[PDB]
Amino acid sequence: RLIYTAGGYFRQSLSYLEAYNPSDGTWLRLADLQVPRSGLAGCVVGGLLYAVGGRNNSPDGNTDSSALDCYNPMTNQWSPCAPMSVPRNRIGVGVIDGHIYAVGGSHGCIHHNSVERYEPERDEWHLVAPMLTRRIGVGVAVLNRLLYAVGGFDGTNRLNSAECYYPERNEWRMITAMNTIRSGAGVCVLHNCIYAAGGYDGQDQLNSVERYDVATATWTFVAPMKHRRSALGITVHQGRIYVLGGYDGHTFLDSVECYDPDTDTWSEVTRMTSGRSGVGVAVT
Numbered sequence: 232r233l234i235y236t237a238g239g240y241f242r243q244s245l246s247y248l249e250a251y252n253p254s255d256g257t258w259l260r261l262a263d264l265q266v267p268r269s270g271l272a273g274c275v276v277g278g279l280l281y282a283v284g285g286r287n288n289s290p291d292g293n294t295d296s297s298a299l300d301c302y303n304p305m306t307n308q309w310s311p312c313a314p315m316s317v318p319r320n321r322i323g324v325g326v327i328d329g330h331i332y333a334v335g336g337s338h339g340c341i342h343h344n345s346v347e348r349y350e351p352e353r354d355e356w357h358l359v360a361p362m363l364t365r366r367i368g369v370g371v372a373v374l375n376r377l378l379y380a381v382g383g384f385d386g387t388n389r390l391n392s393a394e395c396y397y398p399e400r401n402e403w404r405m406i407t408a409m410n411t412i413r414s415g416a417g418v419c420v421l422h423n424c425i426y427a428a429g430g431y432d433g434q435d436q437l438n439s440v441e442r443y444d445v446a447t448a449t450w451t452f453v454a455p456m457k458h459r460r461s462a463l464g465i466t467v468h469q470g471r472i473y474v475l476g477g478y479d480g481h482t483f484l485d486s487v488e489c490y491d492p493d494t495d496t497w498s499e500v501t502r503m504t505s506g507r508s509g510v511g512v513a514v515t
C-alpha cells in the first residue's frame with residue numbers, strides 16, 4: 232500500500248498525483264488531476280481514491296471547487312463524480328462506514344459551517360446538520376464511527392475548538408478544545424487518539440503536535456515535528472504518521488517527516504519530488 236499525494240500548491244495549484252513507498256523509498260508518478268487543485272482533501276472508500284474540493288489558483292483565475300473525482304490505482308484513471316452543493320476550498324474530509332463527509336471550507340468570503348455526505352454507490356450528495364462553527368482549514372478525523380472537526384479558521388479567528396458529529400443523531404457537540412490554536416493543521420487518527428500536527432495560530436506556523444484521548448477527554452502534547460508547517464498533508468501507514476509538505480512561513484516544503492509513537496520521535500523520511508502545500512493525501 233502506498234501514500235498518495237494529490238494536487239497541492241507551489242506558485243500555482245498543481246495536478247501532480249504521486250505515490251511514496253516508505254518500504255523501498257521510491258516515488259512513482261501517476262496520472263495528473265483533471266483540474267489542478269490546492270486546499271483539497273483526499274480519502275479512500277473501497278480502495279478508490281477521492282479528491283474533494285479545493286481551489287485552482289492559476290495566472291488566469293482562482294476558482295474554488297465543488298468537484299469530487301475518483302482515481303482507480305490499478306487502472307490509472309480519474310472519473311468525475313457528482314459535485315458538492317457548494318465549492319469548498321480548504322475542505323476537511325472524513326469517511327464513516329462507506330460515505331464521504333465534506334466539512335467546512337470556503338467559497339470566496341463565505342466560510343462554511345455546512346457539511347455534506349456522499350454515497351459512492353448512488354453518486355449523491357446531501358446536506359447534513361451544520362457544525363456549530365464556521366471552519367476553513369479544518370482537520371477531520373474519524374474514531375469509533377464518530378466524526379471530529381478540529382481547529383481551523385472562521386474568517387476572523389483561528390480556532391483551538393473541536394466538535395464531534397454523531398451520525399445516528401445528526402447533531403454536533405463541542406468537545407474539549409486543543410491546547411493550541413491551529414488552522415491548516417494535519418489531523419488524523421493513529422491508534423485510539425486524535426492527532427493534530429502543525430498548523431498556523433495566527434502568528435506563527437507550528438511544529439507542535441498534540442493528541443486527544445477520548446476516554447479521558449484530554450489533549451496532550453507529544454514530540455514536535457522538526458519543521459514548522461501549515462497546510463500539510465497527513466496520513467497513517469502501518470501504525471505510523473506521515474506529514475507531507477506544507478509551508479513554514481518562508482518556503483514550501485518537500486520535507487516528509489514520520490512519527491513513531493512507540494519512541495515518540497520524528498525523523499525526516501524523504502523529500503517530495505517538489506515542495507508543495509495544501510495537498511490531499513490517503514492510503515490504498
Ligand SMILES: Nc1nc(=S)[nH]c2[nH]ncc12
Pocket residue numbers: 368384414415430431436461462478480
Ligand atoms: N501559513 C498560514 N496558514 C494560514 S491558515 N493562514 C496564514 N496567514 N498567513 C500565513 C498563513
